[PDB]
């Protein structure tokens, strides 16, 4: 795994919920691909077996709460491992869980490239979560509130992106619009690296 990803580089295309980073992500593979892996669907892919503790993340993946923190990075060595040996790189979907410290993704993987983070929210995630939300009966349909529920989500992504764009490492892609809006931007991150 690791001795494939060292000489691998890891790349995460994914930002905020109603953004649209998915959209484009598979999008990605679709042009260089990038392996398309996200750090939920791997422990929801896993809990065929790995349902030991799944008793948890099974109903959390549903509930929208935090997937495994503790896994993600030995799944994340795990979703590489699988492609790297024909993966240029790969894309991380999804996100772990939170940074603000840094040492310890690349901790288990051991080597980040690029970081994705897919900006939309005040603009776009408040149209967006209403088609998805609303149409369906939903909260997200809280086109009012949905800025403020991404307001509270910057104190949470905002202190960390920011603190990648010290290292000029992490790329935030503006899916304040259409798939273009976000589109052409995630792929500034992808040739950004390359």
């Not at 669907?41 to 109903?59: C, N, W």
């Amino acid at each position: 795994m690791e001795e494939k990803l060292k000489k691998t580089k890891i790349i995460f295309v994914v930002g905020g919920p109603g953004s649209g980073k998915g959209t484009q992500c598979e999008k990605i593979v679709q042009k260089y691909g990038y392996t398309h892996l996200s750090t939920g669907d791997l422990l929801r892919s896993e809990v065929s077996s790995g349902s030991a503790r799944g008793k948890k993340l099974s109903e959390i993946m549903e509930k929208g709460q935090l997937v495994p923190l503790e896994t993600v990075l030995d799944m994340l060595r795990d979703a590489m491992v699988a492609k790297v040996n024909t993966s240029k790189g790969f894309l991380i979907d999804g996100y772990p869980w939170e940074v603000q410290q840094g040492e310890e993704f690349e901790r288990r993987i051991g080597q980040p490239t690029l970081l994705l983070y897919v900006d939309a929210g005040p603009e776009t995630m408040t149209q967006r979560l209403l088609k998805r939300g609303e149409t369906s009966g939903r909260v997200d349909d809280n086109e009012e509130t949905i800025k403020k529920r991404l307001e509270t989500y910057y104190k949470a992504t905002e202190p960390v992106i920011a603190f990648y764009e010290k290292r000029g490492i992490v790329r935030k892609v503006n899916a304040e619009g259409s798939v273009d809006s976000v589109f052409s931007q995630v792929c500034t991150h992808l040739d950004a690296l390359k």
